[PDB]
CSV table of C-alpha atoms in Angstrom, one decimal:
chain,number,residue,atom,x,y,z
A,1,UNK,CA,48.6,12.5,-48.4
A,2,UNK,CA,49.3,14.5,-51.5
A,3,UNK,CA,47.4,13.4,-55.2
A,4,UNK,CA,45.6,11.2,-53.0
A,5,UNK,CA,41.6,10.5,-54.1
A,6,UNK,CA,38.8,11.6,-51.8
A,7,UNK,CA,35.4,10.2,-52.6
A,8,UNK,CA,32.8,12.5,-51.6
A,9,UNK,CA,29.4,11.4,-51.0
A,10,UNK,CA,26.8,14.3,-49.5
A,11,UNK,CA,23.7,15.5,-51.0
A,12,UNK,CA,23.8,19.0,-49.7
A,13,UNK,CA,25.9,21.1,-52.0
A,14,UNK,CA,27.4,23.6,-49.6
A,15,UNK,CA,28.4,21.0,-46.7
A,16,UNK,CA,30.1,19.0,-49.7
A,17,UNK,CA,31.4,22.2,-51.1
A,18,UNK,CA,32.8,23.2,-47.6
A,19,UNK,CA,34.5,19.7,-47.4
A,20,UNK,CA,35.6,19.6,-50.4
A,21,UNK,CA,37.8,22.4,-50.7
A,22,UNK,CA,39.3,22.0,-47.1
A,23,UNK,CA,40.7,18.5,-48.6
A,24,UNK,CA,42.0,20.4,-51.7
A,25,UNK,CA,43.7,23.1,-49.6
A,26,UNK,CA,45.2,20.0,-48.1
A,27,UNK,CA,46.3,18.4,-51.5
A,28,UNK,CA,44.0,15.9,-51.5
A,29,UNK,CA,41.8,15.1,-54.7
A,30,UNK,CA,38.4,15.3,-54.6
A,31,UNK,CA,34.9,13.5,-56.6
A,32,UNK,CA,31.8,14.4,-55.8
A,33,UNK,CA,29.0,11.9,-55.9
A,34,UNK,CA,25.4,13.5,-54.7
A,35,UNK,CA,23.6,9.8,-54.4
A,36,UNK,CA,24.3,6.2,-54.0
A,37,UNK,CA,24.3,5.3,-57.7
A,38,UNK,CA,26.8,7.9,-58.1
A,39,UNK,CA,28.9,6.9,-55.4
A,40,UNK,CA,28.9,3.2,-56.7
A,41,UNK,CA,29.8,4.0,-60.2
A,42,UNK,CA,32.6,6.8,-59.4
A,43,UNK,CA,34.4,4.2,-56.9
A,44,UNK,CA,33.9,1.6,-60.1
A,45,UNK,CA,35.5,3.9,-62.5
A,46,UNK,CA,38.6,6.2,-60.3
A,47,UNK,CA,41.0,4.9,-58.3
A,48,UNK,CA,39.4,5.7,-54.9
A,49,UNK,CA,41.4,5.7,-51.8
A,50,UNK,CA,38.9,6.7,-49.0
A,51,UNK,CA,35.4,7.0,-49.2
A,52,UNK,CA,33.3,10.0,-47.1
A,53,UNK,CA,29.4,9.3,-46.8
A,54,UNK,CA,26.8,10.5,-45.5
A,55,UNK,CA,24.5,8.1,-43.8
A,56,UNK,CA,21.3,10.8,-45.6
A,57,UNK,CA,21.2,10.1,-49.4
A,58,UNK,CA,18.0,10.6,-51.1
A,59,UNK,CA,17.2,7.3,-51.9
A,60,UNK,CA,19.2,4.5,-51.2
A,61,UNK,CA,20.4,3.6,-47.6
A,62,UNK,CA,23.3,4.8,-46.9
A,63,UNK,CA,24.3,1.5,-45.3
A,64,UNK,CA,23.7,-0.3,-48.2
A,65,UNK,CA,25.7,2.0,-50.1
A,66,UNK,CA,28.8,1.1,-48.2
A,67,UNK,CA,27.3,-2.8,-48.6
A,68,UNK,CA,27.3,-2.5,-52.0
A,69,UNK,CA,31.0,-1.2,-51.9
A,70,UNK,CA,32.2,-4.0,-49.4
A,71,UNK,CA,31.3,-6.4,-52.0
A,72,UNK,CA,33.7,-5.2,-54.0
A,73,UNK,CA,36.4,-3.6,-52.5
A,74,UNK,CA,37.6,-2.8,-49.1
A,75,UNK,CA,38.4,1.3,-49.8
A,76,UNK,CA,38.4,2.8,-46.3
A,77,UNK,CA,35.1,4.8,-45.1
A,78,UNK,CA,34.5,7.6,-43.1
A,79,UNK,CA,30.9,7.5,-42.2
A,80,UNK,CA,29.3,11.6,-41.4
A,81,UNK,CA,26.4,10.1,-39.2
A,82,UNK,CA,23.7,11.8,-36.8
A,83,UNK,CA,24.3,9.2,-34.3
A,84,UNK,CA,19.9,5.3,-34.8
A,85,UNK,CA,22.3,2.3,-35.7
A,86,UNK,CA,25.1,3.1,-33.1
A,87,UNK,CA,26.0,-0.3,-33.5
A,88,UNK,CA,26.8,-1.1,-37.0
A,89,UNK,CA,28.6,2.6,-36.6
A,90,UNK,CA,30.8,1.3,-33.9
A,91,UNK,CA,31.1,-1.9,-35.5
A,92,UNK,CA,33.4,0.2,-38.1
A,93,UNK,CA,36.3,0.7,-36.1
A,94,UNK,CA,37.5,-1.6,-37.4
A,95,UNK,CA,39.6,0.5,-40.1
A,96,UNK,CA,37.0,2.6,-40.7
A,97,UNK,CA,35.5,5.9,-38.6
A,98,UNK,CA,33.2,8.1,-38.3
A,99,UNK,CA,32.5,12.4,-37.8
A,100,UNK,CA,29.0,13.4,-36.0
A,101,UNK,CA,26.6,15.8,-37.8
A,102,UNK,CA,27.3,18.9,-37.1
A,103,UNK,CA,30.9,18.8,-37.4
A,104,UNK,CA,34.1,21.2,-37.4
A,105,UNK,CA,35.8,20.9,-41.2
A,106,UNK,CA,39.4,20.4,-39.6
A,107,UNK,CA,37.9,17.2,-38.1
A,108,UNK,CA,37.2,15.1,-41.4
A,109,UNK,CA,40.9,16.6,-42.2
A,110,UNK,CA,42.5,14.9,-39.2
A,111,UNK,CA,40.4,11.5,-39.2
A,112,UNK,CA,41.1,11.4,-43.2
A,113,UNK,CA,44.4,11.6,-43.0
A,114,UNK,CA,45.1,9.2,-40.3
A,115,UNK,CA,43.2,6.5,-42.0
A,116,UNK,CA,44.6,7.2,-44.9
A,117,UNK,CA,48.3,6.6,-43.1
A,118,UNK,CA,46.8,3.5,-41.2
């Protein structure tokens, strides 16, 4: 899963600093987008090959967010939910998955990498 590009999406600075650099020490590539707008003009500019996002984003829903991805592309997601809307969460596997909030870092490790190799 080496040089492959990890879309970040996580408002808080240290949970997306603590993700971030277990997928580097994993040779993964990583962009960070803090908010939806961000999120959808990053995946419109790199070439993206999985998508983390957290359901809480300041402004937009998150759901929409992933909505307004789908309508353009089809990049795997790994939602970070709480666990309200249970059913469009398990409506996403699907391809897709999901980690619960709190979570252990090595756990977005393992479900990254075996979408990725899906």
């Amino acid at each position: 899963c080496q040089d492959k590009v990890i879309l970040v999406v996580e408002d808080d600075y240290d949970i997306g600093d603590i993700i971030e650099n277990y997928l580097k020490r994993e040779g993964m590539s990583v962009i960070r987008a803090m908010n939806g707008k961000q999120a959808i003009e990053l995946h419109a500019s790199q070439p993206i090959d999985l998508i983390l996002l957290d359901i809480k984003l300041p402004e937009l829903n998150g759901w929409e967010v992933l909505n307004k991805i789908r309508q353009k592309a089809q990049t795997p997601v790994i939602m970070l939910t709480a666990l309200d809307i249970d059913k469009v969460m398990a409506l996403r596997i699907g391809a897709d998955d999901f980690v619960v909030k709190p979570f252990n870092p090595n756990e977005v490790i393992a479900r990254v990498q075996a979408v990725l190799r899906r």
